[PDB]
């Protein structure tokens, strides 16, 4: 995984700039390596100097070159997906959510766009084998809209240990944009430590919406979103886990999802969700830079997300 | 093509000079003689005079005069031009993409800016009378949403071995603005070697937008972005190879591309996006020098980008 | 026209000195005339008495001294306009563009301001009494973006031989700040042999944005600016040639033609280019020391610049 920022002692630099990088937010030498010099410099007790040395000393242990794409491929071959419960669902997706990616999934109301994360944050701590993870599972709420009962309900169905389960989740409710993005340090300050496997982050948008309810705060508040999703990407890519984020919907004079071009362009995967009938639902592949645009059936049963038993 | 820095021993300078050179960046004996005295005098080991005798010794070598817009439209007779793979969108561009400029297109979110990429990297690769390049494809990435499986679908498509396109494709990532401009120098190191054809950036400002978040950080990031723009200028001169980029689009309080006045001076052809019904996209030439304002309707298969099959 | 310097030997001269002063620049007797004696002393193989002897010899054929504005105006009376093709665009002008002054043209990327030299290289070529000037082309280019291709098109529209269009134009392309300084030598001394009637520079100052980055080197690049600005005012002044340049646009926090105070002083037409509607654009007199402010309509047709054929 991610190499320790303690080794970056051994390579000829002292203790105390080592804590300094810490207080900064940097705990791995994959972190530092793709930090451009200007953040660096703006850390008060470092030199330009030191930055240069750093970030000389940080190149050597992670690669920046060009590789042949023979070799990414075969990389790619081992990508981790996590599966979703729904053998039609994991159909559409190929397999399951990739892990180094955002995905994102928005829909009307009532379209169960939470029970979706309420069952991942279950099924990503399954054996690889049975298609799950082998990874913890942080939460990050914004709607205090989070269950216990249904990660149960859906623990039960896989046959695992209630308590076990809720042991290995990590749960916190945002109540500003401040906040938000605040909590994204203690992330990775603890996704160091332990092992994770998924990031759930409902609502990245429910906030924006009435923070900055002035008319010319718009440009002031897609500036702080696109800060917000590039830290996003920065994890993905660090420890190469798995990002998920929920979006809400607005009108047009049917529906449009809300965050702009940013989020559009910064996103990867996007799922389109509206009701079927009954409890079914309906998923559509909204965009992907791999996948075909295709429709998918599910409904929402008492043991989470599964297919539809009619 | 281009003539190796190693010819320049034998005009009466020293081996010392010329590796002096090559850590600066210099590789071929074009490349030191179209680079000012200013660059060559900030190198640490050079005096005036032996800048002096270089570019003296340099511009024998390489013609710099004035010649007749005969000869210059002879030896545009011979541009190659690659196809895109769909018949409308090459009698759009009167034949293909030039090599030997910067081509930009931009557009809405999953308008396919990412697809074009992915067909041109293996169309690139056909034989001249088939409307390929005959070499090797160059892709440099800042999303993460590089694809093989793409590559071989559209591989199979003109029944090309799938391991022998794999092997002529170059892959990194960049991760900042300065990874993105190291890439640069490396990229012309590998040029001399081999033979490329085809030089692919995206996103060229999916970077800029985020790093330079402070507002009077304006200016101090268009430069660098300037500097960007004109070493991609002169790797295109140099090594005769055709340079694509992608880039986002910001809606305006009906959309306009990101960049500024820098990037819309500094392209010479420029492609507008949008999608049209189904798969079908609609594809509007904003900006070229020599061809007329007209629309062309493509479709994206699965085989890659091909005509609008109906 | 303009006295060859051969002349300067039958005045009391070896033939020596000549040619020391034939490799300075110094190719006809009127532009030894215009230069002060420092330039002279600073040759390395004339004494204070040779130059003293070569100005007061050259002071003979040249004259420098006061006259009547009578005799002044009949000289205006027979300046040579080029006409651009557009009979509104000439209205605007007063017939055409003047030979003898420095015309500046600039606005917005896809204005066209590349189409305008274009449709002036061929129109330059007609006879007289069809608003011609008679005389050869010379097309100093940094961009890379010259066509021959609109040449022919524009050519075949006043019923002209493509080929005798493409061998009476000069083409050669710039790359840094000092090689387009250099060309201009190698200008003057073919435009002694044969007969020009328009120099173009396009662009005057698309290499001075990104050579001279560095913030302390803005008084660095403003002297070479007027040091470029004025070997063109001296080429204007000697061989009563027509000098068109074409700028940049940076947006101001609506837009700032770029280059300082020195290019609006030294230049004295100045065009204002903004986009119409469809393929119309509107033209705008910025500064002229005879013409008032106003504005006209023109569009880019298929056969070079022409009137707004709706
Ligand atoms: N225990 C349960 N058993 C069966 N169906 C349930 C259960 N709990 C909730 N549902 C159903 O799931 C849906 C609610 O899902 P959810 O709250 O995730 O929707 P949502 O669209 O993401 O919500 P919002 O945008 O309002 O936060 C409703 O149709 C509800 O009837
Ligand atoms: N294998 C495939 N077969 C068919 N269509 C596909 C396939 N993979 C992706 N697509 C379609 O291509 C589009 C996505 O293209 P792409 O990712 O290049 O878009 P983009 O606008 O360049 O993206 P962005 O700006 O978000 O990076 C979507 O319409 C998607 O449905
Ligand atoms: N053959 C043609 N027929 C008709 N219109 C054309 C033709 N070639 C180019 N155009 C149009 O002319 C415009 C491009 O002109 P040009 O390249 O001179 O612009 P510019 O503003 O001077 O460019 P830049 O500053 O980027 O160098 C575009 O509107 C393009 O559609
Ligand atoms: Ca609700
Ligand atoms: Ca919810
Ligand atoms: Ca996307
Ligand atoms: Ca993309
Ligand atoms: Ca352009
Ligand atoms: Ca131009
Ligand atoms: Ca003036």
Redesign the interface.
């Known amino acids: 995984g991610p190499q320790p920022i303690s080794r970056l002692e051994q390579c000829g630099i002292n203790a105390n700039d080592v804590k300094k990088l810490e207080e900064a937010g940097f705990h791995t030498v994959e972190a530092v ?6 953040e660096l410099i703006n850390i008060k007790g470092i030199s330009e100097a030191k930055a240069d040395k750093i970030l000389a000393e940080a190149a050597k242990l992670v690669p ?7 070799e ?2 075969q990389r ?1 071959s081992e990508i981790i997906q996590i599966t979703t419960g729904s053998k039609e669902l994991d159909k559409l997706l190929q397999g399951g959510i990739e892990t ?2 955002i995905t994102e999934m928005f829909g009307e109301f009532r379209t169960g766009k939470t029970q979706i994360c309420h069952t991942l944050a279950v099924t990503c701590q399954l054996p690889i084998d049975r298609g799950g993870g082998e990874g913890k599972a942080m939460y990050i709420d914004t709607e205090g809209t989070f269950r216990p009962e249904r990660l149960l309900a859906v623990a039960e169905r896989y046959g695992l240990s209630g308590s076990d389960v809720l042991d290995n989740v990590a749960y916190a409710r945002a109540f500003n944009t401040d906040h938000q993005t605040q909590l994204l340090y203690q992330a990775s300050a603890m996704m160091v430590e332990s092992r994770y496997a998924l990031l759930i982050v409902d609502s990245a948008t429910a906030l924006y919406r009435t923070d900055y309810s002035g008319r010319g705060e ?1 440009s002031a508040r897609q ?1 702080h979103l ?2 917000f999703l ?1 830290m996003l ?1 920065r994890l993905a ?1 660090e420890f190469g886990v798995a990002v998920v984020i929920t979006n809400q919907v607005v009108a047009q004079v049917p529906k449009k999802p809300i965050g ?2 940013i989020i ?2 910064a996103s ?1 995967t996007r799922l389109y969700l509206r009701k079927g009938r009954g409890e079914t639902r309906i998923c559509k592949i ?2 992907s ?2 996948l ?2 295709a429709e998918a059936m599910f409904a929402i049963n008492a043991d989470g997300v599964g297919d539809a038993k009619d």
């Open positions: 390596a793709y930090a451009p010099k200007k920046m070159g060009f590789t042949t794409a023979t990414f491929h790619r180094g990616s718009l500036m696109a800060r590039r990407l890519d702009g071009n559009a362009h990867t909204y965009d830079p791999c075909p645009e």
